[PDB]
């Protein structure tokens, strides 16, 4: 659904068509003007950062594994005559429709008997999904993956690509897959009895030399070398695929460009009348196009074990019954062609729709992981109460759409309760300790991180014990639309730390809430604060991120009693464009204000600019008003004359309109 | 149901997150301050008990057995229609919760030749009550096997008698076969053979019953725990962790306190031991068993309407020893030679070391109210904050005072205990000696300490009144009409484990009131007899 994913984008964000991606890492964000203030009994110290960049790093790598599951049939496409008043295939009108058609008379009785089983095999989501992945593999084919590259680095702990993804050879995305071609046979109209467990599709005119090569590779096993997101492992959809094309199927060309895959999709959707099938495939790919680079070192627990992708079995019986598909189809919603029409016009817009969906999910799974099991709406039972339909199993797209509904605070409506795609809530529901590997840089690591060893020499491979999952992404596109006090994503905020002159700089935060806001605002001001817990004896640093520049309470890496000693004569100025706290006395009052917002994207430590035309909000009415218009100007070549007009020179001629 | 069991705890007590349990026995109580004031014909006397510890004792030892039964489906084409009406994951979560607490508190020792109850005259060992047992730790008790966790791939026909939803899931489905008798390691049948890959709320309440078992108040209160109670585990079909300890203690206390009253109800009234659950429930369960029996007793205790969303009948049934017209034979060990005088023993002549048997006809109270102290006060327990007890002293002929009435005798020995005078009386009908100092832990006298259902007259020995604990109020010679007025203030909770202090660390309401379970409370209406209890509709 293009419509619901479009509304997630911010108001200030004005996207263009083309986006020239030339790397496997993008820092999307915005530039804002922060007017910071520090008030005290001595006086006020004002600062101003005119261009403050708050970013979330997003990569094109992520371990996924496809499995073939059984899903509901999508009945949108079949002629409206055979359907009854309630909206199910009234068998008796099917036998009537087949009888009054251009079918062979000896096949009518035997084909009608099979109809009861074969007509309820309508799900082309798996085919469209694979054909969409082939489009983006050939478009962004020049992106590279190095084996010994930095997945994450925060100064203390480092995590390499070798650690998370073993059995991984370095190669380009184009050179990753070597897809073998499945057989594309021609359906004989005079076949005695239809062959079930072999799908048959429709086609307009002649199957082109390149269309054979695309359909051949789409219905085949994906066995990748490099762990890419749009080239993950998928099982063999089918062995053989029939195509009811009276004009013969040309043999396989071998080569094809990304423009030829768009040609193949547009013919397949139009012939089969499968627009709702495409809408399902569009939302599936939106989840599993890009995966987020973790905010903290201990936020890598989400991407340790491979999340399963639920691909519904390829099943289509249109080739055997050409009569039942015509120009008057049955559809539930009137805006059922909107998702395809959006993709054909603006293919590269999927990148923006993808980051909008994963940012919405991973933000909400952040503040869902911090609720006790003894509650009404908890970790296990947040999907059941929200869903008001009848899906087969609460997995895939249902779990991701219900998290988006919680974030935006609106009602998401789909025409069919389809349960296909990636399932994210895997590591959460387990409710056990996860062992993430790490290579150390400094020697004073295991004070900060909950490490397995207490003394570790530099360059050693250690393990961190993560119990509660910290947030993987900070809200950026969904900044101050549905604000919570955990993230504290306000435009205006203030904190009041109360100290007396008798205290020699040392302040104890009994409250946990205002400790989080103090440590966060001090980092905007470019000050390196290092607090020490009095009960346990561990240490926390506000500088625990190089992207957002905020301090969340989950950076403590421990749930206990709150007694944080901060010594305010060991505060060090780290960044540029900073206010100085030289020597405070009395009550401190910190405050900031974010005024304006400008969309910015970075890649390879350089600005990535959006190019091409101005993207519009395509509605169903905007095309069918031109159908209402029809260009009703009678196609008659009316040539109008020009009267020559003489003036002073007479050498040169001058023509007038009347 | 957290919000239900959380309400049972007293208003003053708010427990912390963690609790490091390092034994098979925990005392829980409070340190109250008592301000007594005495008045009689001789004159007036005023005193004050500065620190008084009233506590019960709860253990992790209880013989239980699991049975697989068919229960209602929790609702929170041909094949789907048959399977949806039997979906229940309560039995799987039950075993998964038990595995959590075996690993956490997996350093608790059960010694076979240890004490269970010890008063001074009689003694019960763990050899008795639990035969077919050996010495083992909780982690060493179970050696669980693993069921096949297969992957569900396209398969069109669901295989029958296998649910579809590694080492944890494998062991949760397997058989439990314990060596030492432990509460959270009780015998359970095999759930399933294979497993393809509100229900939790049921399993949470179901474990709150089993987790802990009471240590009996007197030797007669061991009759409850002889016969193994059955835990009804539903059939498995599908198509602050440490706070549970406090909720469990709160639940089992409320049940065993109220069964003290239900046992004394005569079997010739509207509400009796047979027909008290059936009148209370206002739903449609499969059978009045398990949790429905327990939650009915909590409603009768607190005096509030308890409501669950689904009428689930799964968990331990306690009312088994109660529902049988037979005297129960508690096996005991003789410590002092004068044991047959006190306890109703078979052999009237005994020697220190002999193993004899005592007879129990009416089941006495197993626990005294501690957490549920003064939320609703009955005359039997007399658990008031403020009370004025008035009794008329019988004429002392030689050195003996005859108490013919039953109520007056209860009030007399209740006063003398609060003053701290160990009085010993002789029951004239039976010819056995009663003592007000029966229980040391809870500092109160119940009428069931006489150990004789029926009618009798008591001959109190006024010359041999010992002085165990003496405040300034305490007098030995009462004269005329005795008035005692006491006030209880300054409550503070304290827990003891292994004879040391255990410290805590860390738009429209669519009613839909047709299917929902509702449990109506009963109020005790006191009558002249005092020995018999009677229930009425409020």
Curated annotation (Swiss-Prot), chain A:
Location within or outside the cell: Virion
Which SUPFAM superfamilies does the annotation name? L-A virus major coat protein
Tell whether Transferase is among the UniProt keywords. no
Source organism's superkingdom?
Answer: Viruses
Q: What is its main location?
A: virion
Kindly list the biological process annotations in GO that this record carries.
Answer: viral translational frameshifting
**Gene Ontology, cellular component aspect:** viral capsid
Keywords (alphabetical) are: Capsid protein, RNA-binding, Virion
Could you tell me one molecular function GO term of this UniProt entry? RNA binding
Task performed by this protein:
Capsid protein self-assembles to form an icosahedral capsid with a T=2 symmetry, about 40 nm in diameter, and consisting of 60 capsid proteins asymmetric dimers. The capsid encapsulates the genomic dsRNA and the polymerase and remains intact following cell entry to protect the dsRNA from degradation and to prevent unfavorable antiviral responses in the host cell during all the replication cycle of the virus. Nascent transcripts are transcribed within the structural confines of the virion and are extruded into the cytoplasm.
The UniProt entry's sequence similarity note says: Belongs to the totivirus major capsid protein family.
Which named protein is this?
A: Major capsid protein
**Lineage, opening ranks:** Viruses, Riboviria, Orthornavirae, Duplornaviricota, Chrymotiviricetes
């Amino acid at each position: 659904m293009s419509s619901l994913l479009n509304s997630l984008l911010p108001e200030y964000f004005k996207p263009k068509t083309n986006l020239n991606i030339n790397s496997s890492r993008v820092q999307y964000g915005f530039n804002a003007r922060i007017d910071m203030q520090y008030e005290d009994d001595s006086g006020t110290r004002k600062g101003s950062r005119p261009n403050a960049f708050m970013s979330n790093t997003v990569a094109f790598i992520g371990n996924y594994e496809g499995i073939i599951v059984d899903d509901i049939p999508i009945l949108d496409g079949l002629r409206a005559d055979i359907f009854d008043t309630h909206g199910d295939l009234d068998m008796g009108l099917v036998e009537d429709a087949l009888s009054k058609s251009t079918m062979i008379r000896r096949n009518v009785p035997t084909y009608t008997a099979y109809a009861s089983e074969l007509l309820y095999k309508r799900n082309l989501t798996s085919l469209f999904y694979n054909m969409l992945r082939l489009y983006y593999i050939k478009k962004w084919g020049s992106i590279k993956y190095e084996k010994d590259a930095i997945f994450y680095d925060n100064g203390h702990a480092c995590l390499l690509n070798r650690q998370l993804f073993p059995k991984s050879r370095d190669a380009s995305l184009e050179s990753s897959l070597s897809l073998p071609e499945a057989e594309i046979a021609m359906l004989d109209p005079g076949l005695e009895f239809p062959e079930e467990d072999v799908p048959a599709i429709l086609w307009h005119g002649r199957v082109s030399s390149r269309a054979t090569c695309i359909l051949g590779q789409a219905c085949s096993e994906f066995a990748p070398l490099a762990p890419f997101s749009i080239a993950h492992y998928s099982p063999q959809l089918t062995r053989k695929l029939f195509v009811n094309a009276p004009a013969g199927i040309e043999p396989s060309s071998g080569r094809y460009t990304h423009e030829d895959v768009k040609d193949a999709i547009t013919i397949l959707v139009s012939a089969n009348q499968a627009y709702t099938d495409f809408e399902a495939a569009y939302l599936m790919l939106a989840q599993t196009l890009v995966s987020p680079v973790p905010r903290t070192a201990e936020a890598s627990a989400w991407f340790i074990n491979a999340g399963m992708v639920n691909m519904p079995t390829l099943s289509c019986a249109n080739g055997y019954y050409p009569a039942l598909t015509n120009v008057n189809p049955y559809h539930r919603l009137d805006t059922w062609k909107d998702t395809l029409n959006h993709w054909v016009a603006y293919p590269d817009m999927l990148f923006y729709h993808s980051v909008a969906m994963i940012e919405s999910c991973y933000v909400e799974l952040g503040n869902v992981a911090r609720v006790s099991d003894s509650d009404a709406i908890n970790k296990y039972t947040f999907t059941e109460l929200s869903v008001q339909g009848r899906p087969v199993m609460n997995r895939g797209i249902i779990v991701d759409l219900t998290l988006v509904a919680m974030r935006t605070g609106r009602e998401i409506s789909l025409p069919y309760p389809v349960s296909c795609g990636l399932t994210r809530t895997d590591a959460l529901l387990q409710g056990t300790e996860i062992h993430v590997p790490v290579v150390v840089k400094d020697i004073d690591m295991p004070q900060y991180y909950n490490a397995i060893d207490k003394d570790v020499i530099e360059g050693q491979e250690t393990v961190i014990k993560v119990k509660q999952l910290p947030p993987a992404m900070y809200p950026i596109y969904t900044y101050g639309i549905n604000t919570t006090e955990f993230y504290s994503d306000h435009f205006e905020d203030q904190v009041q730390v109360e100290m007396a002159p008798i205290d020699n700089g040392k302040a104890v935060f009994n409250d946990a809430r205002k400790f989080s806001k103090f440590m966060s605002i001090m980092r905007m001001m470019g000050n390196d604060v290092t607090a020490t817990d009095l009960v346990t004896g561990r240490k926390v640093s506000n500088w625990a991120d190089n992207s957002s520049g905020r301090f969340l309470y989950t950076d403590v890496k421990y749930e206990g009693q709150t007694a944080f000693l901060v010594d305010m004569d060991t505060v060090k100025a780290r960044d540029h464009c900073w206010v100085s706290i030289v020597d405070p006395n009395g009550t401190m009052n910190l405050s900031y204000k974010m005024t304006n917002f400008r969309a910015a994207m970075f890649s390879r430590n350089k600005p990535l600019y959006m190019t091409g035309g101005s993207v519009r909000t395509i509605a169903t009415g905007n095309y069918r008003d031109a159908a209402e218009r029809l260009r009703a100007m009678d196609e008659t070549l009316r040539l109008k004359p020009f009267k020559i007009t003489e003036k002073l020179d007479f050498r040169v001629a001058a023509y007038a309109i009347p």
